[PDB]
Amino acid sequence: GAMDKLELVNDGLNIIDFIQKNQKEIQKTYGRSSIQQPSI
Amino acid sequence: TTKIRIFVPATNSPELRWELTLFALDVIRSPSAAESMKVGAAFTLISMYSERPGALIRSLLNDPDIEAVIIDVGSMVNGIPVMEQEEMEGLMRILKTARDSSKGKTPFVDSRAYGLRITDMSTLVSAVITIEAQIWILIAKAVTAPDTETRRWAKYVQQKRVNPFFALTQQWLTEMRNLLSQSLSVRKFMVEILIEVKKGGSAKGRAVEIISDIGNYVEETGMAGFFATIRFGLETRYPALALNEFQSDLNTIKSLMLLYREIGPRAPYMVLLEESIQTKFAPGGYPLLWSFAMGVATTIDRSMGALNINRGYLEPMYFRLGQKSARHHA
Ligand SMILES: [Br-]
Ligand SMILES: [Cl-]
Ligand SMILES: [Cl-]
Ligand SMILES: [Cl-]
Ligand SMILES: [Cl-]
Ligand SMILES: [Cl-]
């Protein structure tokens, strides 16, 4: 349905907003900041 | 601007519409018809399902690169519209050359269809839908990549929604498909009908059924990478999205997502419009996020197996990262 796709888009936008504002905190959460980095 | 002559039936008369339909068929296969006449005949065919085709075209024509002179046709003499001159003579040359041109062939696989007199409403509808369905199907194999047939037409037949008697020859359909490829206007107007049908508001049930089927196929196909990316790359909310390398792809897909919101229904049908926007939402514009999303999808969803294959933009390092992130979140 078109409704479900509109909700996908608005949730997609809120997710990107959250990431862009907390990108460093989430990188502590994730363990690294570059994909070229060893993960652990 | 570039004027376009569009002949339109003035009545619900089955016989008038059937001869008018045949004439339009003939213009498109005609050697001495200007591309402007052929464009008009496409409008005539594409709108023939509606109660009032001239009114359909006027209300929905949103296109600056063309001026439509819609011409009401109250009756046919010798297979050509009656006009209310040399202009009459021209429309004869269009039939004669269309006819003489080909090896006695008609636009129809069963030539009997070409000589047929229709006076019953349900036979007109059936013939008109069957012809229109085959034109819309051209639109369907255009949006796909040629990386795939007839399952389309065959489905409609077993479903009895289409009448195999009114099947068009390959030579005719190639004429039509050429016209679609070369003419932004016809596609643009078809896009209007796809939007109009989705809305919708007409009682031509069987027509808008088949147009919806196409319309929905065009949407699903062209936005499939976009929404898979959002659904499997964004919605899953994996912390790997905060890696520096994803940030430009995040900008891109944010711009695309805002686009989708302000354009509306027109957005999925961009794949049928001007060349430079056909690939607006294509995943090749955000390929690392796309590859990441692919890696998640094929890991967690049993319907997404197709995405294991590189169609050109797959970035193995980001695909693997998707698999790993999906395996890590149970
Ligand atoms: Br790809
Ligand atoms: Cl209608
Ligand atoms: Cl032909
Ligand atoms: Cl109908
Ligand atoms: Cl970077
Ligand atoms: Cl993760």
Curated annotation (Swiss-Prot), chain A:
Localization annotation: Virion; Host cytoplasm
Residues of the signal peptide: none
Superkingdom of origin: Viruses
Region N0 binding: start-end pairs: 3-37
Assembly and interaction partners: Homotetramer. Interacts (via multimerization domain) with polymerase L; this interaction forms the polymerase L-P complex. Interacts (via N-terminus) with N0 (via Ncore); this interaction allows P to chaperon N0 to avoid N polymerization before encapsidation. Interacts (via C-terminus) with N-RNA template (via C-terminus); this interaction positions the polymerase on the template for both transcription and replication. Interacts with host STAT1.
Domain notes: The N-terminus consists of a long intrinsically disordered tail. The central part contains the coiled-coil multimerization domain (PMD). Forms a four-stranded coiled coil structure. The C-terminus constitutes the alpha-helical domain that binds to the nucleocapsid (N-RNA complex).
Leftover remarks: The P/V/C gene has two overlapping open reading frames. One encodes the P/V/W proteins and the other the C protein.
Physiological role: Essential cofactor of the RNA polymerase L that plays a central role in the transcription and replication by forming the polymerase complex with RNA polymerase L and recruiting L to the genomic N-RNA template for RNA synthesis. Also plays a central role in the encapsidation of nascent RNA chains by forming the encapsidation complex with the nucleocapsid protein N (N-P complex). Acts as a chaperone for newly synthesized free N protein, so-called N0, allowing encapsidation of nascent RNA chains during replication.
Protein name: Phosphoprotein
Organism: Nipah virus
Lineage: Viruses, Riboviria, Orthornavirae, Negarnaviricota, Haploviricotina
Stretch of the intact protein here: 1 to 38 of 709
From Swiss-Prot, chain B:
Classification lineage: Viruses, Riboviria, Orthornavirae, Negarnaviricota, Haploviricotina
UniProt GO cellular component terms: helical viral capsid; host cell cytoplasm; ribonucleoprotein complex; viral nucleocapsid
Span list, region Ncore: 1-330
Record has RNA-binding as a keyword: yes
Disulfide bonds: none
Family per record: Belongs to the paramyxoviruses nucleocapsid family.
Free-text note on domains in this protein's UniProt record: Ncore is globular and carries the regions required for self-assembly and RNA-binding. Ntail is an intrinsically disordered monomeric domain in the C-terminus.
The keyword Transport belongs to this UniProt entry's keyword annotation: no
Top-rank taxon: Viruses
Outcome recorded upon mutating S102R: In strain: Isolate NiV/MY/99/VRI-0626
Residues reported in the UniProt entry to bind RNA: K141, R152, Y217, R311
Subunit description: Homomultimer; forms the nucleocapsid. Binds to the viral genomic RNA. N0 interacts with the phosphoprotein (via N-terminus); this interaction allows P to chaperon N0 to avoid N polymerization before encapsidation. Interacts (via C-terminus) as N-RNA template with the phosphoprotein (via C-terminus); this interaction positions the polymerase on the template.
Localization annotation: Virion; Host cytoplasm
Name assigned to this protein: Nucleoprotein
GO biological process, one term: negative stranded viral RNA transcription
Effect after changing M304I: In strain: Isolate NiV/MY/99/VRI-0626
Keywords in alphabetical order: Capsid protein, Helical capsid protein, Host cytoplasm, Ribonucleoprotein, RNA-binding, Viral nucleoprotein, Virion
Job of this protein: Forms the helical nucleocapsid (NC) in a ratio of 1 N per 6 ribonucleotides, protecting the genome from nucleases. The nucleocapsid (NC) has a helical structure with either 13.4 N per turn, approximately 20 nm in diameter, with a hollow central cavity of 56 nm in diameter. The encapsidated genomic RNA serves as template for transcription and replication; encapsidation by N is coupled to RNA synthesis. Forms the encapsidation complex with the phosphoprotein protein P. Before encapsidation, the newly synthesized free N protein, so-called N0, is chaperoned by P.
GO molecular function, one term: structural molecule activity
